[PDB]
Amino acid sequence: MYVKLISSDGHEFIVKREHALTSGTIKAMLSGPGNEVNFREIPSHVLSKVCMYFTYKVRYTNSSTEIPEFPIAPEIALELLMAANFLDC
Amino acid sequence: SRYTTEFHELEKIGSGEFGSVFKCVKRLDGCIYAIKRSKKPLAGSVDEQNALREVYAHAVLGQHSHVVRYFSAWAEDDHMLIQNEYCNGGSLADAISENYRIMSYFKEAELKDLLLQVGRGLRYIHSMSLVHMDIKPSNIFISRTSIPNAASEEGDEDDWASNKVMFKIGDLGHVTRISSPQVEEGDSRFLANEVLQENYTHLPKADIFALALTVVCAAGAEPLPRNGDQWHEIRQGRLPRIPQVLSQEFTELLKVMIHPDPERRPSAMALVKHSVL
Amino acid sequence: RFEVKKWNAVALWAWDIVVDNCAICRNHIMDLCIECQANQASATSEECTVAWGVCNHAFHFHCISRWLKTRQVCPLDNREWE
Amino acid sequence: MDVFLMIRRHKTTIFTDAKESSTVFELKRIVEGILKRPPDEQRLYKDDQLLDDGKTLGECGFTSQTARPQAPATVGLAFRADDTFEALCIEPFSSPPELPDVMK
Amino acid sequence: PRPVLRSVNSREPSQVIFCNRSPRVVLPVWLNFDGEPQPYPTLPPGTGRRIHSYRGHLWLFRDAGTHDGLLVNQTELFVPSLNVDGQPIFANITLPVYTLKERCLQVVRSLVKPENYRRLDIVRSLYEDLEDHPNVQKDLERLTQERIAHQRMGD
Amino acid sequence: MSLKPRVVDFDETWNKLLTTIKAVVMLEYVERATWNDRFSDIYALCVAYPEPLGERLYTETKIFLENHVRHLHKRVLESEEQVLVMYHRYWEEYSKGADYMDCLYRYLNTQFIKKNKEPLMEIGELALDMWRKLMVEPLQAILIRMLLREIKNDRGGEDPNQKVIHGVINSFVHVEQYKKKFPLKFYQEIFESPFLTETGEYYKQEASNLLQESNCSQYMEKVLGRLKDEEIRCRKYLHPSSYTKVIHECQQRMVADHLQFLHAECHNIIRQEKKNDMANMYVLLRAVSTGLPHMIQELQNHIHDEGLRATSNLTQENMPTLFVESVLEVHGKFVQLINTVLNGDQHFMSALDKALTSVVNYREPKSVCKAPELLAKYCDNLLKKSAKGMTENEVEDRLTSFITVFKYIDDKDVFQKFYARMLAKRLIHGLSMSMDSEEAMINKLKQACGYEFTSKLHRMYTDMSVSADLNNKFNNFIKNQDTVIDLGISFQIYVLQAGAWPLTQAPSSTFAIPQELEKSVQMFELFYSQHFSGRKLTWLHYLCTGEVKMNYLGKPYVAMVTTYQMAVLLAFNNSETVSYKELQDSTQMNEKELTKTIKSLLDVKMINHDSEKEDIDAESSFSLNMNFSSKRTKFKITTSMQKDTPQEMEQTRSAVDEDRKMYLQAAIVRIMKARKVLRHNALIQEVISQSRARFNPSISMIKKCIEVLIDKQYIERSQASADEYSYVA
The enclosing domain of C53 has a CATH number of 3.30.40.10
Domain membership flag for residue F69 = yes
* Helix F346-360 / helix F319-341 crossing angle, nearest 10 deg: 170
Computed on alpha carbons and rounded to an integer, the radius of gyration of chain A in Å comes to 13
Query: How far is residue F223's CA from residue F252's CA, in Å, rounded to a whole number?
Result: 12
Which residue in F171, F34, F201, F163 sits closest to F104, CA to CA? F34
B134 is catalytic: yes
Q: Which domain holds residue C46?
A: 1-82
CA distance, residue E153 to nearest chain F CA (Å): 12
Which residue among E10, E11, E48 places its CB closest to the CB of B151? E48
Is B19 labelled a binding residue?
Answer: yes
Q: What is the CATH number of the domain that holds F340?
A: 1.20.1310.10
Would an 8 Å CB–CB cutoff place B99 in contact with chain E?
A: yes
Q: Are residues F679 and F634 in the same domain?
A: no
Q: Note the Cα B89 to chain centre separation in Å.
A: 13
Residues F635 and F650 in one domain: no
Locate all alpha helices (DSSP H) within chain C, ordered by sequence. Answer: 34-39, 61-70
Helix, strand and coil in chain E, % to nearest 5: 25, 30, 45
Residue F38 located in a structural domain = yes
Going by the DSSP 8-state scheme, the letter that residue F135 receives in this structure is: I
The DSSP string of F162-194 is: HHHHHHHHHHHHHHTTS-SS-TTHHHIIIIIHH
Q: How many residues does chain B have?
A: 277
Nearest to E21, CA basis, from E58, E65, E74, E89: E74
Q: Do chains E and A touch (3 or more CB pairs under 8 A)?
A: yes
Test mutation, F548, F558, F624, F636, chain C, max C CBs within 10 A: F548
Q: Cβ distance D8 to D76 under 8 Å?
A: yes
Query: If you measure CA to CA, which chain E residue comes closest to F4?
Result: E123
Rounded Cα–Cα distance for residues F311 and F323 (Å):
6
CA angle E115, E121, E125 (to 5 degrees): 80
Test F3 with E123 for CB contact under 8 angstroms: yes
Q: Do E104 and A77 touch (CB under 8 A)?
A: yes
Q: Which residues of E9-31 are buried (b: 16+ CB within 10 A; e: fewer)?
A: eeebbbebbbbbbbebebbbeeb
- Judged by 3 or more CB pairs under 8 A, whether D touches F is no
The answer to whether C23 faces chain F, any CB pair under 8 Å, is no
| Residue F324 contacts residue F379 (beta carbons within 8 Å) | no
Domains and CATH numbers, chain E: 13-147 (2.60.40.780)
Mutation pick from E19, E93, E103, E104 vs chain A, by most beta carbons of A within 10 Å, is: E104
Could you tell me which of F278, F326, F271 has the C-alpha nearest to residue F301? F271
What residues of A are in contact with residue F103 (Cβ under 8 Å)? 28, 31-32
| Sign, CA torsion F526/F529/F535/F536 | positive
Chains contacting C (3+ CB pairs below 8 angstroms):
F
Give the contacts of F235 (CB within 8 A, at least 6 positions apart): F243
Name which of F130, F140, F110, F132 is nearest F122 in CA terms.
F110
Structure letter (DSSP) for residue C22: -
DSSP letter assigned to residue E43: B
Q: What's the domain count of chain C?
A: 1
Q: What's the gap in Å between the CA of A65 and the closest CA on chain B?
A: 7
**Terminus-to-terminus CA distance in chain F, angstroms?**
107
B143: number of Cβ within 10 Å: 16
Beta bridge partners of residue F538, listed in sequence order:
C12
In 3-state terms, what secondary structure has residue C80?
strand
CB atoms within 10 A of CB F544: 19
Give the span between the Cα atoms of A13 and A26, in whole angstroms: 14
> Is some CB atom of chain F closer than 8 A to the CB atom of A28?
yes
**Helix/strand/coil (H/E/C) assignment for every residue in F483-551:** CCCCCCCCCCEEEEECCCCCCCCCCCCCCCCCHHHHHHHHHHHHHHHHHCCCEEEEEECCCCCCCCCCC
Selecting among B77, B78, B113, B134, the annotated active-site residue is: B134
Interface touch D72/A76, C-beta < 8 Å? no
Distance CA E1, CA E3 (A): 6
Query: Residues of F with CB below 8 A from E121's CB?
Result: 4
Tell me if A20 sits within 8 A of A62, measured CB to CB.
no
Q: Which CATH number fits domain A17-86: 3.40.50.300, 3.30.710.10, 3.50.50.60, 3.10.129.10?
A: 3.30.710.10
Q: What are phi and psi of E62, to 5 degrees?
A: -105, -175
- Judged by DSSP in three states, F211 sits in helix
Q: Report CA torsion sign: F531, F532, F537, F541.
A: negative
Torsion of CA D37, D42, D45, D48, to 10 degrees: -130
CA–CA separation, D64 and D55 (whole Å): 17
User: What CA–CA distance (Å, rounded) separates F469 from F267?
Assistant: 66
Q: CB-based burial of residue F614 (10 Å sphere; 0-12 exposed, 13-18 middle, 19+ buried)? A: exposed
Contacts A–D by Cβ distance under 8 A: 65
Q: Please, which residues have CB within 8 angstroms of residue C49's CB and are 6 or more apart in sequence?
A: C43, C60, C61, C62
Residues 6+ apart with CB under 8 A from B98: E11, E12, E13, E54
Q: What's the rounded Cα separation, in Å, for the pair D28 and D37?
A: 9
Say yes or no for a CB contact (<8 Å) between A88 and F32.
no
Residues of D in contact with A76 (CB under 8 A): 96
Whether residues A87 and E97 touch (CB distance < 8 A) is answered with no
Residue E15 contacts residue B101 (beta carbons within 8 Å): no
B36 is annotated as contributing to ligand binding: yes
Could you tell me which residues come within 8 angstroms of residue B75 by beta carbon, excluding any fewer than 6 positions away?
B40, B81
What's the structural domain count of chain F? Answer: 4
Identify the closest residue of chain A to D91 by CA–CA distance: A11
Tell if the CB–CB gap between F538 and C11 is shorter than 8 Å.
Answer: yes
The answer on whether C28 is annotated among ligand-binding residues is: no
CATH number at residue F699: 1.10.10.10
Domain boundary among F144, F164, F190: F144
Q: A69: distance to nearest CA of chain D, Å?
A: 9
Neighbouring residues of F36: CB distance < 8 A, sequence distance ≥ 6: A29, A34, A37, A38
For chain D, the three-class secondary structure string (H helix, E strand, C coil) is CCEEEEEEEECEEEEEEECCCCEHHHHHHHHHHHHCCCCCCCEEEECCEECCCCCEHHHHCCCCCCCECCECEEEEEECCCCCCCCCCCECCCCCCCCCCCCCC
- Dihedral sign of CA atoms E19, E21, E25, E28 in order: negative
C-alpha B210/C-alpha B258 separation (Å) is 8
Burial state string for B59-90 with b = 16 or more CB within 10 A and e = fewer than 16? eebeeeebbbbbeebeeeeeebbbbbbbbebe
Q: Which of 25-64 (C) contact F at CB < 8 A?
A: 28, 30-31, 34, 37-38, 45-46, 52
Tell how far CA F595 is from the center of its chain.
Answer: 59
Tell me how far apart the alpha carbons of residues F229 and F579 are, in angstroms, rounded to a whole number: 105
Contact assignment for F546 to C8 by CB distance below 8 Å: yes
Spell out the SS3 assignment of B205-249.
HHHHHHHHHHHHHHHCCCCCCCCCHHHHHHHCCCCCCCCCCCCHH
What domains are there in chain D, each with its CATH number? 2-103 (3.10.20.90)
Q: Residue A5: list chain F partners with CB under 8 A.
A: none
Contact E40, E27 (CB under 8 A): yes
Question: In terms of C-beta density within 10 A (0-12 exposed, 13-18 middle, 19 or more buried), how is residue F269 classed?
Answer: buried
Reported as type and span, the H/E element at residue E25 is none
Q: Which residues of F touch C45 (CB under 8 A)?
A: 455, 458-459, 462
Residue F592, domain CATH: 3.30.230.130
Q: For residues D97 and F4, is the Cβ–Cβ distance under 8 A?
A: no
Residues from chain E contacting residue F4 (CB–CB below 8 Å)? 121-123
- A60 shares contact with chain E (CB less than 8 Å): yes
Under 8 Å between Cβ of F453 and F403: no
Of E23, E24, E100, the CB nearest to A89: E100
Minimal Cβ distance to F489: which of C7, C16, C34: C7
Task: Give the residue from chain A lying closest to B156, CA to CA.
Answer: A65
F699 shares a domain with F628: no
Domain limit, last residue, from F619, F642, F665: F642
User: Which value, in Å, is the radius of gyration of the alpha carbons in chain F?
Assistant: 49
Chain E CB contacts of A80 below 8 Å = 100, 104
- Range of the structural domain that residue F618 is part of: 540-642
Residue B44 CB neighbours (<10 A) = 7
Whether residue B153 lies within 8 A of chain A, CB to CB, comes out as yes
> E11 contacts in B (CB within 8 Å)?
97-98, 101
Query: Would you put residue A10 in left (φ > 0), alpha (ψ -120 to 50) or beta?
Result: left
Query: Within 10 Å of residue E132's Cβ, how many Cβ atoms?
Result: 10
For residue F622, the 8-state DSSP code is E
Domains of chain B, each with CATH number or no CATH: 2-85 (3.30.200.20), 90-272 (1.10.510.10)
* A-to-B residue pairs, Cβ atoms closer than 8 angstroms: 3
DSSP, collapsed to helix, strand or coil, labels residue B255 as helix
* C20 belongs to an annotated ligand binding site: no
Give the Cα separation of F624 and F224 in Å (integer): 93
Contacts of E105 in chain A (CB under 8 A): 81
Q: How far apart are CA D75 and CA D48, in angstroms?
A: 10
Nearest by CB to A33, which of F35, F39, F40?
F35
Q: Which of F 34-73 lie inside 8 A of E, CB atoms?
A: 47-49, 52
Pairing assessment for the beta strands C9-15 and F535-540 based on DSSP bridges: antiparallel
Distance from CA of F46 to the nearest CA of E (A): 10
